[PDB]
Design a protein around this ligand. Structure first.
Ligand SMILES: [Mg+2]
Ligand SMILES: [Zn+2]
Ligand SMILES: [Zn+2]
Ligand SMILES: [Zn+2]
Ligand SMILES: [Zn+2]
Length: 1223
RNA sequence: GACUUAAUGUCACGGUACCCAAUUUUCUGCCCCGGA
RNA sequence: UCCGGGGCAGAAAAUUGGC
C-alpha cells in the first residue's frame, strides 16, 4: 500500500532550479535538467530553499527498471506474465505527457492470456498506471492505482550548502577542444544524498514487480543510487588590508603579490611553519632580516603578524586560513594596482530469444602516474543560484567539500567515450537534444556503461604549477603571461568503478580497460582531466578485478545486493570467496595482446619516447615562491614536486626534484619553433603551421604530451643541492651593487657527476614523418646543448651534456705594447695604483633593431666556443656555500674561510664570473653603457652618482631606446643575452698554491677587502664619473704570500678571508655558447675572450691584490646552421669586429683606438712569457703610522688625498690613465 | 499536508571545463680610503 | 685631538591573456 521508500545517492547528483512546466521552457538550464533533482526557493531573496526529486522522475526510473526486469525474464516476473505496456498517447485523444520518451523501449513477446483493461491488468500495466482514474491532469491522490510522491531531501537550507555550480564540458574528439559548455549544480551526497518519498500502490498484483524495480534503479539525477523500502573572511580582509598598507609604507606594493603567492603555498607546510618559526630568517647578521617575512607591519615583523593572524584565526583550518589570506592579500593588491544546453517516435526493441544479459562490474584503482589536473571554475563563479578579475589561482583543481581530489563521473566518462571512440576506430560527436538515439558504436556502448565519481582518500592541498609564456622575440617572459595551476600529486589513487549492462562484454571496452591498465610491461594510459599536453592526468588502472552478475538466472541477487552500488569499495577489498551470491569473477577477460581493437587503435595511439637528460651543470628550474617558505633561505631554489605514495598512503617525505613538464614542453616547442620559423608568427589563430600541428594552438589540442623530467640521479649526490652565490659588480666601483647580491640553489650538477633527468613524451598516431623529424631534431637540439633547462642558462645553469634515448622508443697573435712606465722602470721601484678607470667617453651606440630570438637566422652565427682558461696568477674563486669551508672558524671565530668553488668535488669556475668579467670587458671594448651602476649612491654631494654619470652611459631600460652592444650581446631585463657562458671545469696544472706557513697549505689568508670609495675617484662635485674600474695584472699576491704570518696577526680575523687558491698554470675549460650573433659580434666576443698574447683578464677575488690573472685561449670555435671554424675564418671574424669599433669611433692593431689602447694596457700582463718586469701594484696606506707602510715613501692617502700636494684634477687624470706612477 | 511532481513515454551516465603559453630575463661573491 | 671600519645580501619586470 503506502510504501515509504528511501533514495540515497553514492556520488554527487545533479541539481537544478525548479520551474513549472509552462515556465520550464523559458530557461535552458531547467529544460536540460528535467531528469535531475529539483530546487525550489523558500521564502524571499533566493537564498534558501529545499531540494527534491519529482515522483515523475522516480516513476520514470522505476518504469525503465520494470522494462529491463521484464526483458530479462521474457515479459514475466515471478510467474505472472506481462504485456508490452503502452508508451504512445494520441494528440487527438488528449494532451501529451510532460516528458516524451526518446529512447528505445525494451519489448518482449506478449504471453498474457487476455488483454489489459480497467477490470484486469498485468503488473506492467498496473505500475504504468494505464487504467486508473488518474491521468495527464492531476486532481487528487487516491485516483492513482500507483502514486509516486515527491522525494523530499532527508536532512531553511541554502543552495551553497547543498550544491556547487560546476561548469561541465563537451570536448570535440578531433580538435581536443571544448565545442561548448554547460553548468550543473552537483549536489553533495555525503550530507544531502538521502531522499525520502512515498509510493502508493492500490493493486497488490504488481507489488513484487514494484519493489524489485526499486532495487533495480541504478542511477537517478546523474548519480548511482539504492532505493530502499522503509565572518572570518571580513577580518582576514581587514588584516590583509593592514598588511598591504604597511607594505605600501615601505614602497613594497609589488611584494604583496609575492606574499599572496607565498601565503597560498603555506597550506602545504602545515601550521608549524608559522607556529614553530620555520620561515627563513634572513642572513646571519642582517639587521633588516628577511626581505619579506621581516617587513615591519604596524611596527612588528611579518612573521609575528602572521603568528598573530593564525592565533586569531585558529578556529578555521590552516588550509582555509592560508587560502583566504593569500586570496585577500591578492584581492587588495588588485585595488591598489559558448554556453549551450540540449517528431517523437516509439521504438520497440526486443532482445533475441535465449540471450544472456550480464552486468559486468569493473572495480579498479585509478593511480595518477603523472601529476594531474581536473578543471573547475573559480569559487566566485562556482556559486550556485548566482548565475577587477579576482583569481588568485588561475586554475583551481576540482575538490570536494572535504577538499579531497575528485575525478568526476563526467570527466571519467568523457575520457572513456574518447578512448572508446579511438578503440572502435569511428564514432560521433555527441549531438545534444536529438529526438533519435545515436546509432554509433560508441554511443551504443556508452548507453550500456555506468561509472562512478571517484575521490581520493587524500585531502592535502594542491601543488601550484606556475607557468609562463616566453616571448619569442626576446626570450624573456611575455608581457602578461604568468599564471598558476592547482595540480594533484602523482601516485594518487582513485577508486575506479565501471559497470557494463549488456549481452556480451564488448571487445572495444575491454581494450580501453587494458589500455588504461598499468600492469607490468606497458604504462597506464588513462588520460583524464585537462592540460594533458603538459602531462596533467595520465592515470594508471591497477588492482583490476572484473566481476560479472548473471541477470537472467540470478536477477533477485542483483536486486538484493542493489548491484553492489556504493559498495564497490568493499568489492575491491574482499576476497574471492567473500563475494555476494550471484556475483562471479569474470575469468573470460581478454588479455592485453589478444585484443583486436587495443593492438591497432589504442596501443599505437600515443607512442612513448622516454629518454634521460644528462645535465653536467647546476640545474635551476627556479621555484621562488617555495624559496620564500622554506628554511634553506635562498633567493631561488630548484623545483621539486610532492609525490604521493600508495604504500605509505601519504606524500613521500623527500620531494622529487624535476624540470617541469611545462618547461619540458616549452623547450621542445621553442626548439621546433625556431627551427621552423613558426615561433616568429605574430598570431596563431586558425594556424596550420608545423609547430601548431604538433604542439596545438588555441583551436586544436596538441599531438604531443610532455611529462615531467624526473631526477633519477639524486641518490648518488652527497650534497644534491649546491649553494652558488651571485652578485652584480658596479662598472665604476669594482665591488658589489647597493642591492644586487643573491644566491641560487640549483641541483649540484657537474661534468663528472651529472644529473640524470628521466622524462618522457607521447607522440600521437598520425604524426607526419616531417613532424617526427622535427621532434627528433628538437630532441637533438637539447642533446647538443642549444636549450638549457631552467633558469640562468646564459650563466651556465641547466646545460645538457647529452641525451640517452631508451630502448623501447687557435691563438691570438696580437701583442699590445703595454705601458712605458713599467718598461722604463725595470728595477720595480715604481709603484702603481691597483685599479685605474677607463674614460671611454659619452658616446654609446644603441641598436634599436633588436635581434630576435624567435629563429636561428641564416646570416647570423650560432654555435659554441671551447675556451681554455689558463691562470697566470694564483686564482681565487671562493666556495661561498660554506663560510667554514676550510674548517678553521673554531680557532678564528668570524673569519670567513672558503674552499675553491667546486660542484661534487671537482674544481669549477661558475660561468657567471666568466660571463660577468667578459661582459665587463665587452662593455669596455664596445663603449657600451654602465649596465650595473649605482645610480642611487650619493657623494660626500649636490647630486647622486647617476647624476654624475652621463645619460648615454646609464643602463639600458627597455628595448624602445635601443640596446648598447654589451647589453645587446649579454642581455637586459627585457632581452635574453645571446651568449651563454658555461661553468669552467678543471683539467690540468699545478692544482694548489702551496704555502708552508698556512694551516691549510693550499690556502692563503688575504689582506682585507673594503668597499670601493667613489669619493677618491670623484674628489669634488665638479668632477664626473672617471669610468670603468679595471685592475692591473701584477704579482702582488707574492707579497701577501710572504706576509701570511703578519697578515694573520695584525689584521682582525673577521675582517679578511682565507681561501683555497689555485697555483699559476692551472687550466680550466668553459664553453661559450652563442646564438644569432653577428659576423662582427662573434669576432668581438672572440677578441673579448683572447685579446692578445700579453693581454689577460682579472677573475675572482683579489683583483687589486694581483690574484686571478686568467688567460683565456680558444681551443675550437664550432658553429652550426655543425662545423669547426678554421683559423682563417676566426681571424676574419675578429677583423670585422675591429671596423665596427672604427665606425663607432669615426692583423688588427687595437692600440690605435684610444679607449681600447687604455683598456688593453689596463689588462696588459708585464710578467708574461720571457719578461723581467715585476711592477709593484698596491693601494696606499692612510698615514705614516699605519701598518704596511714603507718608511721614506710618500705613498699615503694623507698626502695623496691632500689637495695642496696632489690637486683634485691631477688625481683623476692619475686615476684615468692606466699604469700611472703613484709613488 | 503544502512547499514541490504528474502518470500509457525523461538516452542527460546525451556533453572531459577542454584548448593554447619554458618561473623566466639581466646581474663577475666581489672589494681601500678615510671617520669624528 | 684621534685609530680604524665592513658593505650589499636581492633590484626591476611580468601575476594572466586569447579561443
Ligand atoms: Mg493513470
Ligand atoms: Zn498489460
Ligand atoms: Zn554516438
Ligand atoms: Zn602556428
Ligand atoms: Zn646597456
Amino acid at each position: 500500500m503506502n510504501i515509504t521508500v528511501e533514495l540515497t545517492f553514492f556520488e554527487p547528483y545533479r541539481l537544478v532550479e525548479w520551474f513549472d512546466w509552462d515556465a520550464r521552457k523559458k530557461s535552458h538550464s531547467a529544460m536540460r535538467g528535467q531528469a535531475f533533482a529539483q530546487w525550489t526557493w523558500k521564502g524571499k531573496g533566493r537564498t534558501a530553499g529545499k531540494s527534491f526529486i519529482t515522483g515523475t522522475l522516480v516513476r520514470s526510473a522505476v518504469i525503465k527498471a520494470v522494462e529491463e526486469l521484464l526483458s530479462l525474464n521474457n515479459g514475466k516476473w515471478e510467474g505472472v506474465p506481462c504485456c508490452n505496456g503502452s508508451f504512445q498517447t494520441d494528440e487527438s485523444k488528449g494532451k501529451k505527457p510532460s516528458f516524451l520518451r526518446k529512447r528505445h523501449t525494451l519489448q518482449w513477446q506478449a504471453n498474457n492470456k487476455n488483454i489489459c483493461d480497467k477490470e484486469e491488468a498485468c503488473p506492467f500495466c498496473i505500475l504504468l498506471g494505464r487504467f486508473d482514474n488518474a491521468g495527464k491532469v492531476h486532481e487528487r491522490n487516491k485516483d492513482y492505482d500507483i502514486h509516486f510522491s515527491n522525494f523530499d531531501l532527508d536532512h531553511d537550507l541554502r543552495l551553497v550548502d547543498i550544491a556547487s555550480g560546476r561548469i561541465l564540458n563537451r570536448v570535440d574528439f578531433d580538435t581536443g577542444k571544448a565545442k561548448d559548455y554547460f553548468r550543473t549544480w552537483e549536489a553533495d551526497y555525503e550530507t544531502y544524498g538521502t531522499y525520502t518519498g512515498r509510493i502508493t500502490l492500490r493493486n497488490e498484483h504488481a507489488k513484487k514487480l514494484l519493489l524489485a524495480s526499486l532495487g533495480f534503479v541504478d542511477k537517478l539525477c546523474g548519480a548511482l543510487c539504492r532505493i530502499e523500502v522503509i565572518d572570518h573572511n571580513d577580518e582576514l580582509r581587514k588584516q590583509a588590508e593592514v598588511i598591504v598598507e604597511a607594505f605600501k609604507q615601505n614602497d613594497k606594493l609589488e611584494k604583496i603579490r609575492i606574499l599572496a603567492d607565498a601565503i597560498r603555498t603555506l597550506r602545504l607546510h602545515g601550521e608549524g611553519v608559522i607556529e614553530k618559526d620555520e620561515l627563513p630568517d634572513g642572513k646571519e647578521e642582517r639587521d633588516k632580516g628577511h626581505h619579506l617575512w621581516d617587513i615591519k607591519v604596524q611596527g612588528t615583523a611579518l612573521r609575528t603578524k602572521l603568528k598573530e593572524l593564525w592565533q586569531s584565526n585558529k578556529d578555521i583550518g590552516w588550509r582555509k586560513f592560508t587560502e583566504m589570506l593569500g586570496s585577500n592579500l591578492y584581492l587588495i593588491y588588485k585595488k591598489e594596482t559558448t554556453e549551450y544546453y540540449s517528431s517523437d517516435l516509439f521504438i520497440p526493441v526486443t532482445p533475441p530469444e535465449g540471450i544472456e544479459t550480464k552486468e559486468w562490474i569493473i572495480v579498479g584503482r585509478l593511480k595518477a602516474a603523472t601529476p594531474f589536473y581536473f578543471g573547475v571554475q573559480q569559487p566566485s563563479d562556482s556559486i550556485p543560484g548566482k548565475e577587477v578579475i579576482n583569481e588568485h589561482t588561475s586554475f583551481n583543481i576540482l575538490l570536494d567539500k572535504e577538499n579531497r581530489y575528485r575525478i568526476p563521473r563526467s570527466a571519467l566518462r568523457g575520457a572513456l567515450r574518447r578512448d572508446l571512440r579511438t578503440a572502435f576506430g569511428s564514432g560521433c560527436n555527441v549531438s545534444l537534444g536529438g529526438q533519435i538515439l545515436c546509432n554509433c558504436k560508441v554511443c551504443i556502448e556508452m548507453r550500456r556503461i555506468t561509472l562512478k565519481d571517484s575521490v581520493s582518500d587524500f585531502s592535502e592541498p594542491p601543488e601550484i604549477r606556475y607557468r609562463i609564456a616566453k616571448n619569442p622575440g626576446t626570450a624573456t617572459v611575455e608581457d602578461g603571461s604568468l599564471f598558476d595551476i592547482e595540480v594533484g600529486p602523482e601516485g594518487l589513487t582513485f577508486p575506479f568503478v565501471l559497470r557494463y549492462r549488456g549481452h556480451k562484454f564488448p571487445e572495444q571496452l575491454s581494450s580501453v580497460i587494458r589500455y588504461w591498465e598499468e600492469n607490468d610491461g606497458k604504462n597506464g594510459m588513462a588520460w583524464l582531466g585537462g592540460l594533458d599536453s603538459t602531462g596533467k592526468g595520465r592515470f594508471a588502472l591497477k588492482d583490476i578485478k572484473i566481476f560479472e552478475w548473471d541477470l537472467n538466472q540470478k536477477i533477485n541477487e542483483y536486486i538484493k545486493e542493489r548491484g553492489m552500488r556504493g559498495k564497490e569499495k568493499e568489492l575491491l577489498e574482499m576476497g574471492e570467496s567473500s563475494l555476494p551470491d550471484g556475483l562471479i569473477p569474470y575469468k573470460f577477460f581478454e588479455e592485453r595482446e589478444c585484443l583486436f581493437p587495443y593492438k591497432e587503435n589504442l596501443k599505437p595511439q600515443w607512442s612513448e619516447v622516454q629518454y634521460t637528460i644528462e645535465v653536467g651543470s647546476p640545474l635551476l628550474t627556479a621555484d621562488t615562491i617555495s624559496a620564500l617558505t622554506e628554511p634553506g633561505n635562498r633567493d631561488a631554489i630548484a623545483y621539486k614536486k610532492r609525490v604521493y605514495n600508495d604504500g605509505n598512503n601519504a606524500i613521500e617525505p623527500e620531494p622529487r626534484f624535476a624540470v617541469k613538464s611545462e618547461t619540458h614542453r616549452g623547450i621542445f616547442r621553442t626548439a621546433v619553433g625556431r627551427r621552423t620559423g613558426d615561433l616568429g608568427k605574430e598570431d596563431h589563430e586558425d594556424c596550420t603551421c608545423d609547430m601548431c600541428i604538433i604542439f596545438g594552438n588555441e583551436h586544436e589540442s596538441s599531438k604531443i604530451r610532455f611529462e615531467d623530467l624526473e631526477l633519477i640521479n639524486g641518490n648518488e649526490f652527497e650534497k644534491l643541492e649546491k649553494h652558488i652565490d651571485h652578485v652584480a659588480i658596479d662598472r665604476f666601483t669594482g665591488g658589489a651593487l647597493d642591492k644586487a647580491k643573491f644566491d641560487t640553489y640549483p641541483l649540484a650538477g657537474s661534468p663528472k657527476k651529472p644529473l640524470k633527468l628521466k622524462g618522457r613524451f607521447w607522440i600521437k598516431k598520425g604524426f607526419s614523418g616531417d613532424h617526427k623529424l622535427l621532434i627528433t631534431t628538437a630532441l637533438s637540439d637539447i642533446r647538443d646543448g642549444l636549450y638549457p633547462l631552467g633558469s640562468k642558462g646564459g650563466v651556465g645553469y641547466g646545460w645538457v651534456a647529452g641525451i640517452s634515448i631508451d630502448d623501447n622508443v687557435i691563438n691570438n697573435d696580437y701583442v699590445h705594447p703595454g705601458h712605458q712606465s713599467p718598461k722604463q722602470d725595470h728595477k720595480n721601484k715604481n709603484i702603481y695604483y691597483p685599479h685605474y678607470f677607463l674614460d671611454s667617453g659619452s658616446k654609446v651606440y644603441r641598436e634599436k633593431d633588436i635581434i630576435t630570438h624567435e629563429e636561428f637566422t641564416e646570416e647570423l652565427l650560432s654555435g659554441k666556443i671551447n675556451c681554455k682558461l689558463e691562470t697566470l696568477t694564483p686564482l681565487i674563486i671562493p666556495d661561498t656555500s660554506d663560510e667554514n669551508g676550510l674548517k678553521l672558524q673554531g680557532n678564528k671565530p668570524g673569519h670567513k674561510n672558503y674552499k675553491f668553488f667546486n660542484i661534487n668535488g671537482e674544481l669549477m669556475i661558475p660561468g657567471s664570473e666568466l660571463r660577468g668579467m667578459l661582459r665587463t670587458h665587452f662593455e669596455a671594448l664596445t663603449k657600451s653603457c654602465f649596465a650595473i651602476f649605482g645610480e642611487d649612491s650619493t657623494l660626500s654631494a649636490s647630486k647622486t652618482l647617476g647624476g654624475k654619470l652621463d645619460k648615454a652611459l646609464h643602463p639600458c631600460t627597455g628595448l624602445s631606446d635601443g640596446l648598447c652592444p654589451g647589453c645587446h650581446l649579454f642581455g637586459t631585463t627585457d632581452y635574453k643575452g645571446r651568449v651563454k657562458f658555461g661553468f669552467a671545469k678543471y683539467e690540468n696544472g699545478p692544482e694548489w698554491l702551496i704555502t708552508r706557513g698556512n694551516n691549510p697549505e693550499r690556502s692563503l689568508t688575504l689582506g682585507v677587502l673594503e668597499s670601493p670609495r667613489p669619493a677618491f675617484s670623484i674628489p669634488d662635485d665638479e668632477s664626473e664619473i672617471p669610468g670603468r674600474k679595471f685592475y692591473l695584472h701584477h704579482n702582488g699576491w707574492r707579497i701577501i704570500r710572504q706576509k701570511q704570518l703578519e697578515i694573520r696577526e695584525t689584521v682582525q680575523p673577521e675582517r679578511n678571508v682565507t681561501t683555497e687558491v689555485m697555483d699559476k698554470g692551472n687550466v680550466f675549460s668553459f664553453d661559450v655558447r652563442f646564438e644569432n650573433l653577428r659576423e662582427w659580434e662573434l669576432g668581438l666576443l672572440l677578441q673579448s675572450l683572447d685579446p692578445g698574447k700579453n693581454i689577460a683578464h682579472k677573475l675572482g677575488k683579489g683583483k687589486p691584490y694581483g690574484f686571478g690573472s686568467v688567460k683565456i685561449k680558444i681551443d675550437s670555435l664550432h658553429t652550426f646552421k655543425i662545423k669547426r671554424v678554421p683559423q682563417s675564418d676566426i681571424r676574419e671574424y675578429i677583423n670585422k669586429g675591429y671596423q665596427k669599433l672604427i665606425e663607432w669611433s669615426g692583423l688588427p692593431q687595437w692600440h690605435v683606438i684610444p679607449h681600447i689602447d687604455k683598456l688593453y694596457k689596463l689588462l696588459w700582463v708585464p710578467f708574461l712569457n720571457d719578461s723581467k718586469l715585476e711592477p709593484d701594484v698596491r693601494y696606499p696606506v692612510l698615514n705614516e703610522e699605519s701598518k704596511g707602510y714603507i718608511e721614506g715613501s710618500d705613498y699615503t692617502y694623507k698626502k695623496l688625498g691632500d689637495k695642496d700636494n696632489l690637486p683634485y684634477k691631477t688625481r683623476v687624470k692619475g686615476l684615468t690613465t692606466p699604469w700611472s706612477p703613484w709613488n
